[PDB]
Design a protein around this nucleic acid. Structure first.
Length: 447
RNA sequence: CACAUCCAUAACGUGCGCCCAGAUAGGGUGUUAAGUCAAGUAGUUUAAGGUACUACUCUGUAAGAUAACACAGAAAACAGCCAACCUAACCGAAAAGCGAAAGCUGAUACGGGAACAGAGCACGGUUGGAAAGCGAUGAGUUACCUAAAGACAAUCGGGUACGACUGAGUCGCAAUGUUAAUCAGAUAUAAGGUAUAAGUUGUGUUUACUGAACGCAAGUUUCUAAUUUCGGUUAUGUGUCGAUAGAGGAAAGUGUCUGAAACCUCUAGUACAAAGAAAGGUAAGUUAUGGUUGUGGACUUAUCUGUUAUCACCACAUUUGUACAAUCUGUAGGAGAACCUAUGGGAACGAAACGAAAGCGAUGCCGAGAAUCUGAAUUUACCAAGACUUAACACUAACUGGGGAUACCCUAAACAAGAAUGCCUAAAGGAGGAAAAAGGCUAUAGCACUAGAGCUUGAAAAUCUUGCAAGGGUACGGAGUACUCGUAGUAGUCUGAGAAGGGUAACGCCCUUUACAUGGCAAAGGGGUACAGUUAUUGUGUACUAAAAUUAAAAAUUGAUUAGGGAGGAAAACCUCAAAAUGAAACCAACAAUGGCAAUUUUAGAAAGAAUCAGUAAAAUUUUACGAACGAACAAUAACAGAGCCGUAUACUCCGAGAGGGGUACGUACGGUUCCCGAAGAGGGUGGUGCAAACCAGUCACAGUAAUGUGAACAAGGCGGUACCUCCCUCUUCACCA
């Protein structure tokens, strides 16, 4: 019943110099206090924002251990942190994750608590972004197309997020408030103890099984720290950058970061040089390739998918700058899709996926229609719907082709094509097709 | 500058598939010698050919029509194709009799049947002249907007593949090829197919491995790749601003309106030349995934007497080069969204795909048409299958004969073997004297063990347990080294081989010669025969010491760095005060710079050290060393599912001038290789899981003389069943293979 670090943060020595938020909060505390105390946690096994879509298995506020916490029953648990991560099929961001145990199954909400602590008159932007998003995909909807100050857009390179870390200034700078300088010593017990397990003995970095689903939480935290001084540069920053070109938005990805107004080049020098000034001075991972020598013109580039623009293509450009679904993505995409030969002669095709005893075309309908949606669905704003369409064309022929292939007939492609499918009205119907293709293209996508 | 829009069709995964001899059971393969066959008219040469002509006939010669000549052809058959058709092929249900039904008997009448391939053994036979597919409605049954925006006009105003969807008439391919006819030689080692497996990744471009049985050999299909408003909508339409002329000037440039510096109308989208623009056909090559090799329609190649003719002049289209349009014209760069340089619009800039990569060479083959040159022939000169018959020869299977061990499953098996009366009238005598059977007579009621049946009977029974040779089928896709079983035979002069030397391949295999007796053969399948191998399993270490850098560091230390520990409601507190309700006091964690065990680095002694002795000679089987592993690996337990490839052939086919490819189970035999190894059902015997029916006064009290019978007591005295879980369980799909 750790209803106490609540105190250890809230009370926290308000006479002898303590908690950073001595400037925003003395009364925003008790609300979130009771939230943790009883609301998000009255019963960790049940009252949680946890793993069984709300919690772990039913534990009487952890019927065994977090019955109590103070005595260090789960004292400094390391949960030996094996290197392990998850990459998602778009909008480049691997996932900081590791083996969550009943302990971690609630450390999740624990650090979520400390998050809301660092949140209420503290935070900005739940996970990556500056305009608080709820998924990369939502971030992928929202954060992009809002500003065109002055030209010559930017890129961003280095990782420093699963490979290079401090983890010690990390836990300290934040410990200066609840881990009070005096009379509060039950704080960092796992903030530290995300103890990585690859014969190496750092912690809380290697997609920590100590806190697994919250490894992103701490990662986001340290990234927020990066931006805590992206601040000072944004102060120094758009002073003349909205002047060098103007006569007629610092990015927080979870992997890449560019800025607001641009337009000159010596400024780009300033950019990368200050980058270097703190890239090690803060992260200890440093600029690669001088991150971009910020680009004068625009270019067909990559930035989590909706390319920065300051026969699988078409001219779409203007005074206002615009996303681009970068074919680049689509290349690997269709590749791993493993359905279109790249060239019998500069030529794309259907091929099922070397799957000979395939499972049932019904669940294949599911597989496709799903991926169809998700792909197109999360594929919100992007210029050139065109190649999206030509994709969809191929993608579709793929679907029913795979289908017929599942049945070993006499070249049954057109048979299926003009027999089933939404066109010939395949319930077994596949209305998640061209119809649904531009249904999505319009719904929640133009929106 | 757009929304809708995109070729079909066989083989690979079934039967019979083991072998030992066939050799017309069907047959087939090919080989030869004998007969026929039929060739627009006739004759010719004299075969009775031929096609060779003589003259004459017919067809056609679109090379965008038109007459004539001059050019090429003209049977007959065989093969074959689609339709439809005994339905005997050949199968099912009834069917049939048959262990006594395990099953076996199905053309029995019915149904299907060119069986999904039987080619490696056919449903036949039959007719006729035809079956998808693909193009274009052959007619129409829905929409669709009617040109100047829509207003009512359907102004049929005009749009039928106008559109949703039924009728294709037509084609063409399907509905085709076979045929013997001057004789050579040279430009073939000609220009070109061509050497040469295999699998197992490394797949990173690496030129690796089994054994690679050829080397050398890495960059790589391409666009990056129409710039004369082809600038802004993909690969068709599909709207537009810009370029120019606004046109009419909507009352549509059709009657009902606003059109205006205009909706809306075409547009106002190089310079020429050149050609053909020719439709079709004839022949070649390109064509959407389970891949490879095929099969059709569509995509490019060439292709189609000349003349006398009448032609009867075609555009457009494109080709090349000129324009400059290039968004630049990227590439790479410097540099206000538009700028600037060698590009050159292909120069890496990429992209992509890849393995002894490609590509190249290498020396083993084929290498038509005989392309042509030149010889020669040249009685119209020549003339011998094209088929189909006969006669004979030789090979012959997946067909015939001869087969046949390894257990299996189940039934009788009268086989056996085992399963034999419950108490009385109460010695004497009888329950079959009354008892009540039991076992048993028809779902067998009683969800369960004596059919509710009367009871018989009172071993019989009919019960279990076993065997079940019987029977039948299970097993013949081969199936590491290993012997045994079944046979040393009928396979046997004649081929894994006689004996061998040679070549002999990666590799056995076949050449020189040797017995007639297994001589060499060497029988089949299926079983048993150890370690490969195999996954699992632990046991034991992943040393057994000691040495080989520390990650080691857990630690002690210390850098004792590192400061600090005050109910939990608490918002400068309220904490509840107490040395001190702040020394953190001396407990908590901070990396440990030294130790730091270890993961281990490797040496390792390996060899009577652990993890084997085989310990022999011999002590008597010990045995130092030495051969000997042994954590410096041994043991336990199940299984080994053909996927190929190279070489000799029943035969095959198809694709081919042939090579050489495709397959025909890794193809059938003998080698030699590499790689066999699950799911999903599933269907068996298991246990447990649970429950409940009881034959069995096993319990009720007992009628009792007991028994037989009395529903609790099935309170599971018990098979069982009973549903879940448990596992070798193919009985079907998994790639037979990008």
């Amino acid at each position: 019943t750790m209803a106490i670090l609540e105190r250890i943060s809230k009370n926290s020595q308000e006479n002898i110099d303590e908690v950073f938020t001595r400037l925003y909060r003395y009364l925003l505390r008790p609300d979130i206090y009771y939230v943790a105390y009883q609301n998000l946690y009255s019963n960790k096994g049940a009252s949680t924002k946890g793993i069984l879509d709300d919690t772990a298995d039913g534990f009487s506020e952890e019927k065994i251990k977090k019955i109590i916490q103070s005595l260090k029953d789960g004292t400094y648990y390391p949960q030996p942190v094996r290197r392990m991560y998850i990459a998602k099929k778009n909008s480049k961001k691997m996932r900081p994750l590791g083996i969550p145990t009943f302990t971690d199954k609630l450390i999740q909400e624990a650090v979520r608590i400390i998050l809301e602590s660092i949140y209420e008159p503290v935070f900005e932007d739940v996970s990556h972004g500056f305009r608080p998003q709820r998924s990369c995909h939502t971030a992928l909807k929202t954060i992009k197309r809002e500003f065109g100050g002055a030209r010559w857009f930017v890129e961003g390179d280095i990782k420093g997020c699963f490979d290079n870390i401090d983890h010690v200034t990390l836990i300290g700078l934040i410990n200066l408030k609840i881990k009070d300088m005096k009379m509060s010593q039950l704080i960092y017990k796992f903030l530290k103890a995300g103890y990585l397990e690859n014969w190496q003995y750092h912690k809380t970095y290697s997609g920590t099984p100590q806190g697994g689903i919250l490894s992103p939480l701490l990662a986001n935290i340290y990234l927020h720290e990066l931006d805590k001084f992206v601040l000072q540069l944004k102060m120094k920053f758009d002073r003349e950058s909205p002047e060098r070109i103007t006569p007629e938005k610092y990015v927080r990805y979870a992997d890449d970061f560019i800025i607001s107004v641009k337009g000159s080049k010596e400024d780009c020098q300033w950019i990368k040089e200050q980058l270097k000034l703190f890239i090690h001075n803060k992260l200890k991972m440093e600029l690669s390739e001088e991150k971009t020598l910020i680009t004068h013109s625009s270019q067909p580039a990559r930035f989590l998918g909706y390319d920065i623009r300051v026969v699988k293509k078409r001219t779409l450009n203007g005074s206002v700058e615009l996303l681009i679904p970068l074919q680049d993505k689509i290349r690997q995409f269709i590749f791993d899709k493993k359905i279109a030969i790249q060239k019998k002669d500069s030529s794309w095709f259907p091929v099922h996926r070397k799957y000979l005893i395939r499972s049932t075309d019904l669940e294949i309908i599911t597989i496709y229609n799903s991926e169809l949606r998700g792909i197109c669905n999360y594929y919100g704003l992007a210029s050139n719907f065109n190649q999206l369409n030509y994709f969809a064309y191929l993608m579709e022929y793929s679907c029913l082709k795979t289908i017929a292939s599942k049945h070993k007939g006499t070249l049954s492609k057109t048979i299926s094509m003009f027999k089933d499918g939404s066109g010939s009205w395949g319930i077994s119907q596949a209305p998640v097709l061209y119809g649904y293709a531009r249904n999505t293209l319009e719904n929640r996508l133009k929106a």
